[PDB]
Every structure is written in C-alpha cells, then in structure tokens.
RNA sequence: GAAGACGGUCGAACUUGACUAUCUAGAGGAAGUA
RNA sequence: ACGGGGAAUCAGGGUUCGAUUCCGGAGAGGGAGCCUGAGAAACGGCUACCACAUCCAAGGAAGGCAGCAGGCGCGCAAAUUACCCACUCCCGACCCGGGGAGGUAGUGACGAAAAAUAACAAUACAGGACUCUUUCGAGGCCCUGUAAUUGGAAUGAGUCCACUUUAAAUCCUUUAACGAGGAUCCAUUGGAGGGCAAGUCUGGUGCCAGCAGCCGCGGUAAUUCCAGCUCCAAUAGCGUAUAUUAAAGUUGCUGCAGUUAAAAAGCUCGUAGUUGGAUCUCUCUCGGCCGAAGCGUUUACUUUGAAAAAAUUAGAGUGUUCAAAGCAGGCCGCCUGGAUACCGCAGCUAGGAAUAAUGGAAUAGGACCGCGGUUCUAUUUUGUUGGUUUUCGGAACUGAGGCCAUGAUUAAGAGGGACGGCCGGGGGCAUUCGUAUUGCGCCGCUAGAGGUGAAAUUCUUGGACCGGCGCAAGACGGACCAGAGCGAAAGCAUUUGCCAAGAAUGUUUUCAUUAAUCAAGAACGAAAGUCACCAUAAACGAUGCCGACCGGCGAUGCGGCGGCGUUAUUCCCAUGACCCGCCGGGCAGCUUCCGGGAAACCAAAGUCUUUGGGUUCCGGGGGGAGUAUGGUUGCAAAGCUGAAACUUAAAGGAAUUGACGGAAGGGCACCACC
C-alpha cells in the first residue's frame, strides 16, 4: 500500500503492448523536440508537458516516438530544472503550510502533517544524494525553505 | 512488500495442488521459476506450461497433473557443500526411495541427484515431492 | 515470527541469550545469589555440632511429628534443621555431636511433608545411621 | 566482597583467625609454657 | 686497587590524608519467625 | 577463567566440562633489584623491604616442600618419611660417575576388562508334555522340581616345594603334594499400591511411631509403617547426596509461543541493523601449433590441491588363551607390518560461473583508429679517441579528422510526484442560528415547592414554585444520527466565508527501485492529577506491520464505465432523483466439512512434524512483586528501568453434566386455593 497513509489503491496508468508509433500520426521525432522545446519555456514540468502532448496531439508516449524520456530531452538541450520536479513539489508543499501554520498556530493537523511532508523529503534528497543529482552536502532546511521555491 | 518471488510462485502451486485445480496463474515470471519448474516437469512432478509475455514481467500458466504433495522454497539460500547434502535432504525429504531437493550450483539449477553425479555443491532453492 | 535472513547472527544469539536469563534453572545456577544463599555452598554434603533436638509438625493433610535436628554447621557457621530417617534414630544422637549432614533429594526444596527442611544426617560421631539401625556397629563411648 | 581482590582479603582474614584459633590450641602442650605431655604406657 | 661519599635511575616499603572494602568488640531496639 | 589438543552426553542440530601425564604460558610466601652466564630478572643463586619463622652465651647467625616422601591445618574430599638406576632418557672432562626425572613394589571397590559361588547320573514324583488306550492305565520318549533322596566324577579359592619372573623381589603364567557335600569353601544391595518388575499372606501399631523423590499410606481389617515368610530387579556389586547431559519442540538455527491459558508497544514519524521486483547466451611478444606476459571488474559460493604434532576418536591388519589393551608378529636364517579417514573458522592453490552483491559511455573528459604538435629520455650510429648532431625507441602533456547499428533495459496488479472532476461530523480561523439553563426587570396568582421504597436535607404571603413579556451571560448543538462517513490515534456534527491539507477513483502523464520492518531519537495523545507539566487506561478486535495464495452471497459508502424505462429543468440534449448491471479501493454482515484450533471459535487465529516470504516487540509453573535498592526524567504526584532471599504442587483456559436462589418465564394437585 501506501507509504505513509495506511492504505492501498490500484489506480495506475496501463501501457498497451505495442510500443510501436500509431499510422494515424503524423508527428515526427524532430517536431516533437520542438514541441517539448517550446512548451518548456513557459516553466511546465516534464509531468505538465507529456499531459499537454497525449491530451491535444495524439503524442501517446514520447519513448514511443522519439526514443527518449521528457527529461532527457530537456537535459540534453540544457532546459532542465536545478532540483527534480518531485523534490520541487515536496518543498513548494512544505512552504505553503508552514505559510499558513505561522498564522494559525493551534492547528495540530498541519503541524503533524508537515512531519510526513518533511520526512518525505529527507527521503527522496538521500536518494538524489546517492544518484547524484544533488550535490552532496545539500541540505533542506526550514530557514532556507521559502527561498528555494 | 513482495521479496523471494519464488516463494510466490511455490506457495501458488502448492495451494492450488491441494484444491484439486488444473492449471495455475503464477506471477510475476522469473529466469529461476522457469529452471525450477522445467526440474519438476522433467521428474513428472507438473507437466506443460506456457510463459505469457507481458513487456514488464511475465506470467506462466502451469498445468496441474495431481502428483504433486508439496512444493517448497528454503529461505535464505544457505550454502550447501556436497558433505552436508544427506542432512538436508534427511530434514526434508519424506523417504529415500522418492523426493528431490533443488540446488543452484555453478553447473545450473538442478536436483540434488544429479549433483551428486556432476559432484558439484550449491545452494538450495527449495524442495518437491 | 523471527528474523530469518543469512546475515543475523548476531541479531538471533544476542536474543536467546538474553532470554536464556528468563529461565529459572539457568537463573539460579548462573547468577550467583543462590550459590551464597546455600549453606553448604554447593557441596554435596557438610559436617556440623549438633545444638538440638527439635521437634517439627507435619503439614496438614496429615499428622505427625518429624523428628529433626538443629546443627551448626563447622565451615561456615551457618545453622540448619535437619531431618533424622528412621525411628529410634534420634535415640542415637547426643548433643554436640560431630554429625554428617547431606541434602534431602530435591536440590534445596523442601522434600513433601517436613515444612522447610533441606537436609537429612547421614553419619553421628562418624558411625553411619545405617550400621546403627540394623545394629551393624555401636556408638563408641 | 564483591570484588576479586577484596573477596581474597576477606579469605585471608578468615585463615588468619582460624589459624589463630588452632595455633592457640595446640600451644597449651610440652612447650615452653604447657605442662608436659604425658604417655601412659600398657603392653596388652 | 678495597672502604667511603655527591649525584642520577629503578624502586620495595614507611608516614599523614581522602575515598572505598572487610574482619572483629559493641549498648539500644524493632518487626517477622513459632 | 591458565589457553589449546581434548572429555561426557547426543537422531540431526546442540549443551556442559577440560586444575590434571602432550604442547604453549605463568609462578616459586608478597613485591622489588641484581650477579654470573650462550641462555635467568633464576629462587634446591644473591641483596633489600613486607609478612611469618629458627638457633643464641643477647654479641650475632641462618630461612623458603605450588620437587619426592612425610606432618599439621583445612575440609565432603585424596596413598609409602619403601627399593633401584636394570629399563626410558638426560647431564658431565665421561663406554666407567650421577639422576625422588624415571622405573619397581606398597596403599588403592576413582574407574575399565575377563570371570567362580557348582555339573552330571540313577531313583522317587497321586509331576508335566509326548505314543497307545473311549477312559482307567501302560512307556528307558522328552523335560521340571522347594527331594538336608542316593552316587562317585571334575575343579579351583586356599595351604604350599621348586622353577620361571626381576636390578633383587613380589604378582601372573608353569608344575609337585594337600585342598568340597548343608560342597557351613553360607552373596549382597535395594524393593514388593501406582509411576515401575514383584503379596488387599500373617502378627504388632492405631493420624502415634514412622513411610513416602511425586500422588499418597497410617485415626482398631494398614496391599504403603515395624517384623516373619514368600516373591521381584541388578549382581561382586548395589543404595543415598550433589554437579552436569539426554528426556526439554519447557530457550525452539533445525524447532516453541503471544484473542480467552504467561504474553502485541496509545499512535505516527524515523538512524543503524536485517531484508529487498523483472532484466544482459580471453588474448599478446619471445622460448620450445603450445608455455613464458597480461589477466577477466571485484568478492561471496562451490569443487580441487597442499598445508595442517603426537596421543585421543573413527578405522585396516594381527587368536593379548578371549576381552579392555598392545603394536606386534608369521614360516622352516628367511617373510611382513607399524595403514587410512576426520582435523570446523581464518589464511594459501587451481577449475566452475548458476545464485547474490559491485563496477563500467549521458556536461561525453567514450572506445578503436590513423594523423598532428610540446617536454624529457634508451643508448645502439659514424676503423679508435675528442666534440657537435640527428635518427631509432620510450614515456608525460595538447589540436583536428575518421569510425562504432556510436552509447540511457523495461515501465512492477512495487513506490513517490503531477494533473482531472468529485467526496468527507478531517483540521484551524472568522461568522451565523437554535432551544435549554442561570441571573435580572415587570405583571397576575396564591401556600406550598424539593427529594426517596419512606422521610430526612433545602427556598417561600421580605409572596417562593407557577404563567406571560423583555434583557444579558456562559456554554452546548438533541431528534435527523445509520452495525453510515472522515481522521495516525486520541477523536470529529448549527449556517456561511476564508486558509492549508487528505483518501479513493480516472490517466497510453512523470521519476525510475527511490522500497518493507524498525533500536537509538522524535511529533500528537481520553480522562484524572499538579504549577504549562504530567503521557496514563477493559489505551481492547481482550488480536504487530508489509507481501502473495486460498470459497460463496446480498447489501452499503465513494469514484469511474455502460444500460430498457420513470420523473424535474417546458421540448431537445445535458444533467440531477430512482431502477438493472460491471470495475476499483473502503466500513461491515451472512454463510460453508477451505483448512486450522484445547475448544469457544477463526476466511484468518488458514496455506505447520508435507515444519523456512520479510521484519519488530515480547512470554517461559503459581506467589514474593512491578516490591526493595540503584540509575534516570519530572516542582511534585509520578514516568522508565527493575531484582533476590523465601514459599509452593498446583494456579490457570475452554467445554460438559449436575447444584442453587429472596432472577425472569411455563405446566399441575380439594393430602393447594377459589
């Protein structure tokens, strides 16, 4: 189940089996690039961008087409965030309730939560740490958290 | 969380065995499973069995012929050198005269009969009889 | 259940040692208070001056009175009662007499109806109670 | 004495006085002090 | 070339403290033990 | 606690012992210091001090048995102040001397091996069976005896010449002579209700004396005490005490347990530890087509090799008269032994390459190539010498080009994170309402109002309680409220707004093993209590967490997908309320020969002697006792941790039959009532 709730769910998405590219698509490998590359610009996550290309392009999965991931793609041209996209989210999250638990201090159900929020990012930075994705003496801090984001 | 994946696929076709099923679903399929399962086949123990290709990992349909009274794994694999063999199969095997213990040594996976006879030792998977 | 894997040995003999101390008879004999509680200080038997002759009473679903012997024992000083076998037996006993005491049977328990006593005389004035009872040999005078 | 070397003083103040003890009781007899010892002698 | 002496070193032991431990002489008492 | 070799026990795994004859260490009363010597911090060498202690003419002098004997002491606990260098070896100037090392006797029921205490025949049996007889009863047919019936035959134990043995002896072996009938040339120790083989035979005793490991026996008929007789077991041995091993799957690795019997942490986070999803089928220079030179990423694993003291253990040979032993022996000068295995772990060697870790090219500082440039250098090269000079060859650094199918495994019915529409008594803040209660203002009414089985207690004509009107105050949110929902757990309910979260669902989004369980460490925590602390409960499913597999059935909550037909938005779609399904997680329920379990019961408390998916805490007969002491936190109450002495043969859990009433329901009788 889940890590830090106490349950579980079979909510996923399902690939099909042929990982060939469909007839019915007439996008290429290179206009594609260009796709991702101008849709990197205005600030969207490599999760925002593949929604973007499956909802309104027939671009069912980009390895498909261009034998390649989204982040790859952004990493070797250079259009790459500094800190991962799910690292961001974790302390865009831990900003927003230490935001809102500064002004209502008797809330015990933000103060809890932001313990498996912070928890949470410990152990995703240890596993960037080890990757090095990070540099290693990175560390998350509450002072330091508001200007990262 | 899901570790020993062959202890997955053993425990099924122990269970389905005793309730009288013809054929098993096993999941996911791994290299290990497939040599163990060809050790039973090639002793009478199972008969055919089909590995269904997903892309992500396998599946295997086993046919179920009722010969089968216990198929088990041994956690961890402990290493088995070739003068310890009778204690093991004196622990788990029921009688001298049927049974096999399954060892992976360095010549493959295979009985403990035929070790003996390639003079090799290893480690043991598990056991059938 | 218990941990299994091929690296916790240290994890699986550290545990049954620690719960080896939860077991009375490795308690009592590897823990040294009950060593320095025996008076005979773990030997088989022991020798003491007899003090008196005492009289103890059966424990209830009976009745009788059991014919022991208070003795100060010679290498600790420690006092014991101590029980007399046979009948006529504490006829053959003086006072301040060398006497030989032994244990009664069930290792420091009080054997079943004598309340609280852990011993038995074996010799007097070094003649066994046994070659005075089937009047073997005399006390010497 | 709870402790190894306080454990053997303790032994060896308890030698020290049964020594004592028996060095006291055989002092009495055909020394310097004691009377002397007397043998009764008989042929049987 | 012996005795001897200044010094140095190794250093058992000795004295006075402090802490700690034991053996013994020790009034008083209490409770349980029966 | 001297350490090993080893010892006992043992299905397999184990547990306990090893002071002790082999090896290694240490020390010669306690410490210290030295001399001599190749070697000593030597003690059967010396010098001190400390503790003991001897001789003395009182001035002085001498000491070290944890060597062999021996003595005292201590104790439950252990031998001769014996003979000899003959054997084994050691030392010396040495074929010659010496050796309490060592050998030999003595004491020696520690312990181990062998092995007497009778054998046979003939009689007799109101024996027994066998052949005949219907049965009686007949047999040299075979066995038995509780026959002090008869009979001579055989022997050692002894006594004892001699030899042999030995250094001299003893012992054993060999032989003379003597040596057995109640063959008195006498077998004992424990038992006789059960466990547990074997007498509710006899007398004595009378809850006494005593027996009894345990259950128990004994109170005037004792199967259990004390004795006789008989019988049982082991036997030259057999009881008792204590240590220890098996029994003990009652310490559990193999291999236990935790709802109710002893037991799972209040909840979540979280470090170490432990455990972790699929996936990838040998060559270069020389020396003689092979070796020397590299290994191949690195290990674990496995098989091999060599190295591992003897003794001991397993085990081969061999008639010590057999055996325990020993290492000898066997033919008629010869012949033959004095094997072999095992010796974990760590370390060496060589093969294997499944399993399990680890590496390598993703800012290309990547490989393989030729080309280029910078710096230094091997020393071969010039008949010799002197000097310059290059080449060759080797490094160390840098520029371009070619080439590689140039280079990222898939996307877990593992996990994070996005996104979408919803959902909820989840939380905080603000705001809004509702009645009730209390108090107050006014009016009318009149003597009661309260509480109990009963009064008791308490306010009222200084008009209580009552009835109506108005105001305020603290709160608190009924019914709707569900074997419904949400939350980590305590827990959560009036309207509306704000804030920040969240589960599930949907996804052909994204990362790509990021995970599970968790010491230490941390956040919140009913209610009581204390000046913010306290952190505790039947904190209860009396039930760790994660994962897989294993039967049905109908409901319900949320989300999604479809489907006749009803309604509402006038039609139409689109939605809402219903109705029929399907899918996914959830809260529950019913059911069952799934299989468990002591059962009650449990779809988990199943997949367990056919015992191994990963991991945490924790139990070991009942009490003493969650007590004392110590440590630690807290102002304190208290929190965490936490014994022992001693006591005891049961305490305890399920289930079944009965017994009871001042529990509730039924049926009945003029020896009940009407």
Redesign the interface.
């Given at each position: 189940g889940r890590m830090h709730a106490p349950g579980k769910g079979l909510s996923q998405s399902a690939?099909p089996?042929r990982?060939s590219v469909p007839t019915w698509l007439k996008l290429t490998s290179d206009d594609v690039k260009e796709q991702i590359y101008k849709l990197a610009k205005k600030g969207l996550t490599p999760s925002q961008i593949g929604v973007i290309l499956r909802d309104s392009h027939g671009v069912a999965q980009v390895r498909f087409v261009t034998g390649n991931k989204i982040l790859r793609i952004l990493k070797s041209k250079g259009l790459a965030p500094d800190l991962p996209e799910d690292l961001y989210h974790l302390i865009k999250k831990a900003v927003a309730v230490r935001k809102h638990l500064e002004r209502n201090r008797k809330d015990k159900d933000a103060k809890f939560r932001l313990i498996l929020i912070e928890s949470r990012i410990h152990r995703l930075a240890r596993y960037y740490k080890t990757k090095r994705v990070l540099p290693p003496n990175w560390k998350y801090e509450s002072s330091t958290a508001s200007a990262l984001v | 969380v899901r570790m020993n994946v062959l202890a997955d696929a053993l425990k099924s076709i122990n269970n389905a065995e005793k309730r009288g099923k013809r054929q098993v679903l096993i999941r996911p399929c791994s290299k290990v499973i497939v040599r163990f399962l060809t050790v039973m086949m090639k002793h009478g123990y199972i008969g055919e069995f089909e590995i269904i290709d997903?892309?992500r990992a396998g599946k295997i349909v086993v046919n179920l012929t009722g010969r089968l009274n216990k198929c088990g794994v041994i956690?961890?694999?402990?290493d088995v050198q070739l003068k310890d063999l009778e204690k093991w199969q004196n622990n788990l095997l029921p009688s001298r005269q049927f049974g096999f213990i399954v060892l992976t040594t360095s010549a493959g996976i295979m009985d403990h009969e035929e070790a003996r006879r390639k003079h090799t030792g290893g480690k043991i998977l598990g056991f059938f009889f | 259940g218990k941990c299994?894997?091929?690296r916790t040995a240290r994890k699986l003999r550290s545990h049954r040692r620690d719960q080896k101390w939860h077991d009375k008879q490795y308690k009592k004999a590897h823990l040294g208070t009950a060593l320095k509680a025996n008076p005979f200080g773990g030997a088989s038997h022991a020798k003491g001056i007899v003090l008196e002759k005492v009289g103890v009473e059966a424990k209830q679903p009976n009745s009788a009175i059991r014919k022991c012997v208070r003795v100060q024992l010679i290498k600790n000083g420690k006092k014991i009662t101590a029980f007399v076998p046979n009948d006529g037996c504490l006829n053959f006993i003086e006072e301040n007499d060398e006497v030989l005491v032994a244990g009664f049977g069930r290792k420091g328990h009080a054997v079943g109806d004598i309340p609280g006593v852990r011993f038995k005389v074996v010799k007097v004035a070094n003649v066994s109670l046994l070659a005075l009872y089937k009047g073997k040999k005399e006390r010497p005078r | 004495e709870l402790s190894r070397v306080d454990q053997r003083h303790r032994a060896s103040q308890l030698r020290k006085q049964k020594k004592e003890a028996v060095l006291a009781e055989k002092r009495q007899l055909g020394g310097k002090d004691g009377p002397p010892h007397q043998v009764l002698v008989v042929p049987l």
């Open positions: 690939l089996y990982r | 997903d892309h956690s961890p694999r402990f | 299994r894997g091929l | -």
